[PDB]
Design a protein around this ligand. Structure first.
Ligand SMILES: CC(=O)N[C@@H](CC[C@H](O)[C@H](CO)NCc1c(COP(=O)(O)O)cnc(C)c1O)C(=O)O
Ligand SMILES: CC(=O)N[C@@H](CC[C@H](O)[C@H](CO)NCc1c(COP(=O)(O)O)cnc(C)c1O)C(=O)O
Lengths: 428, 422
């Protein structure tokens, strides 16, 4: 059939396009209602409560020694850094391609983020570029399991242990993913998860989880999330603040909702993994289309699908890849495929990291007089990946999205059947 | 009848002691479920709806909904340019959050002593604590009593300081007829489940008349990004931000609570007035009061006890405090403390480690022992005071507070036993 962009029928009819996420069932509604009526609405509520219940269930499902429920994935990262003694005068190596929270977490704990370039295929921090950027000030590495792909934990943990650095996994985008059969989050000193409403195991709003095998680390995060106070069910409180703490408490209602979601997680995983595999198998046949992949000895959570497009496949060798990216985005959106970008620039190009003002007076950079790259200066692979890639977000997460992803594949095949029109749009 | 502490019948029967707070009605449950089914869980969304309603109800130019009252305070400081090398004067008697908010923005908290009757920061002591590094004052409307905002704003104008009201415990409170939170450069509210206008968990509101201050807080709460409805997220950040976002479900719940606030507030004011009227007649019992030309929110009721009234001259006030707590609790009155020590005594402010390496204190060179005087009023108030929390907030607690007053009058009818225990 003809391209929608030139008057043909869209591959994805409008009545098929909408996807509900989070997927709210009666079990979720009842969990929320029971949390309201339970009269234990806060983390610090004495006795059994939905927050401690989620901590136990998450730890149990993923085999973690300790789980500390917190306000956000960002708070999980910053509290992990605080617990591991990272702070003023320390550097933390993070990927140049991530959600900004990965770069901000070090700043939040008054440490300096140092950006390492990513791998052109995995989109994860390249251990080859991590080694280059270690200094006398480096205290920690935050590998991100970006888009749901576990990072090269062999080489990241090897680098950290060779240099005496801490490892905090940013596993926000990769719940249930494994590296050498180990649940992500449990491989580093600590692991951070986001339960934000867009995530693979969402809450009805905001939420975070910190996991660790280290009891002392867990206890530090437990104090840190509640103004530095010890709060233990049954134990007598002393209302002492033992050190720097915040209000990073998770909501009981959100905890109860995620507990309900977690009971169905692997049923949804089964559907997602089948649906995405079938979708990527069709796109993998299209020349100049690189489907995302799990690295060796890993599984992919498929939180975000990022595709790279080769101009050479459309005879556009020499033309800015961004021209092809824009042409494909326009044609696929006309078919009803909600192709997006995820990050328009590497994190080091963000004003917060370029300006190095931070809290004011250049802190945390001012502690050591540490500098960073100017905008556009470094991280060519992160730039190359952004230049030629489009993403699919949300729609593939729903267990009933099988037929929708086949309609998306119909759209991709239609566009690829009209390479002359792709080339024309790209060249205009 | 004999005292409950020695086998007597309690003035408050066991089956009448329970009080539900927050007060959850079907309207609250429906609001939460409707927000859930609405499929707009992050922040034509419940968060912006609450912002509009709060601003409209209490007459503020701007309202920015955030995760917590603590985040409202720290984002306010950031918005007002408070940071490394700056000092923020806060009360020596408050919730820890008031002292931590400056540390969260890499500024140094400086503790001013409080008033022996209002329990709010003493403006005269604030003036004595001012240095070349002072950038802001956080007056707290502690327990629901508005602070001395005339003197605090006068001091701030003289020294070019920002004023951030900590109105966490004082929703609906007024100062010279003006809603608290709108007098300083900005005002912080907590919607935490224990509060007079609660959410089902955690929540905060930042209010201000200044559009630029509001916009700073709006960006600060969401990683420094500008998020407009219908616009595709470009992830472009314009400065240092956090995840301080309020939950839509919590916002919807507080919107439902607001529809009954005026009725709940009337009940509380009537019930607390009647309760304190009876307790005020007991010698050596000082009931909490609103300062002249202010109204109290009555979030927490703090009572000061005078040993002189039980002829316990020589006996430490803490001894009378302990004796009265034991006897009143035995009768079924859940008398508590609120803060066991002034904030300056808290390990976090004593050790001055902060983020590590003594920051933020390292910037100002405040590594050694705290500058300026002790806080004898804060210590004296803690030494001789007990608090009632939660039970008086429920609009149907009229009869319960009647039984509390029975318990107080009963304990005061046994002064020999009080003196013996003390
Ligand atoms: C089109 C679309 O829907 N877009 C999403 C974008 C969401 C965004 O990717 C999410 C939620 O902010 N990323 C959170 C996150 C965090 C911090 O967790 P947090 O503090 O709990 O947030 C740390 N690390 C990584 C890798 C993360 O991904 C929307 O606009 O919500
Ligand atoms: C017997 C009893 O239950 N008591 C309570 C007491 C709670 C405590 O007073 C509350 C907790 O929310 N006060 C919070 C608060 C904040 C921070 O707001 P936040 O970040 O929104 O919390 C800032 N300022 C002032 C004056 C505050 O009071 C318990 O011990 O939990």
């Amino acid at each position: 059939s003809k391209l929608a962009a030139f008057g043909g029928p869209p591959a994805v009819p409008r009545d098929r396009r909408h996807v509900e996420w989070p997927l709210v069932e009666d079990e979720d509604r009842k969990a929320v209602i029971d949390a309201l009526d339970g009269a234990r609405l806060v983390s610090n509520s004495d006795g059994e409560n939905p927050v401690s219940t989620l901590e136990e269930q998450w730890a149990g499902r993923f085999g973690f020694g300790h789980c500390v429920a917190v306000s956000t994935g960002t708070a999980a990262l910053s509290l992990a850094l605080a617990a591991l003694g990272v702070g003023p005068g320390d550097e933390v190596i993070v990927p140049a391609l991530s959600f900004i929270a990965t770069g901000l977490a070090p700043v939040h704990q008054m440490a300096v983020p140092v950006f390492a370039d990513v791998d052109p295929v995995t989109f994860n921090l390249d251990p080859d570029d991590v080694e280059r950027r270690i200094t006398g000030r480096t205290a920690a590495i935050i590998p991100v399991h970006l888009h749901g792909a576990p990072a090269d934990m062999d080489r990241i943990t090897a680098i950290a242990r060779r240099h005496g650095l801490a490892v905090i996994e940013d596993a926000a985008q990769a719940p249930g993913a494994t590296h050498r059969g180990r649940p992500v989050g449990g491989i580093g000193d600590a692991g951070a998860f986001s339960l934000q409403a867009t995530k693979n195991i969402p809450t009805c709003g905001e939420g975070g989880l910190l996991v660790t095998g280290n009891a002392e680390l867990a206890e530090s995060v437990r104090r840190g999330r509640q103004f530095g106070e010890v709060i233990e069910s049954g134990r007598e409180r002393d209302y002492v603040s033992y050190g720097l703490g915040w209000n990073h408490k998770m909501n009981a209602l959100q905890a109860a909702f995620t507990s309900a979601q977690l009971t169905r997680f692997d049923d949804y995983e089964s559907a997602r993994q089948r649906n995405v595999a079938a979708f990527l198998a069709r796109l993998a046949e299209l020349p100049g289309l690189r489907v995302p992949t799990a690295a060796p000895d890993t599984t992919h959570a498929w939180h975000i699908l990022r595709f790279r497009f080769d101009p050479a496949a459309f005879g556009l060798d020499g033309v800015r890849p961004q021209a092809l990216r824009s042409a494909l985005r326009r044609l696929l959106r006309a078919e009803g495929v909600p192709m997006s970008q995820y990050q328009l620039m590497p994190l080091p190009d963000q004003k917060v990291f370029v300006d190095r003002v931070g809290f004011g007076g250049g802190y945390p950079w001012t502690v050591t007089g540490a500098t960073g790259p100017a905008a556009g200066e470094d991280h060519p692979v992160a730039r190359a990946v952004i230049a030629d890639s489009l993403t699919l977000q949300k729609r593939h997460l729903h267990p009933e999205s099988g037929e929708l992803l086949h309609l998306y594949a119909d759209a991709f095949e239609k566009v690829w059947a009209n390479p002359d029109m792709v080339a024309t749009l790209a060249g205009a």
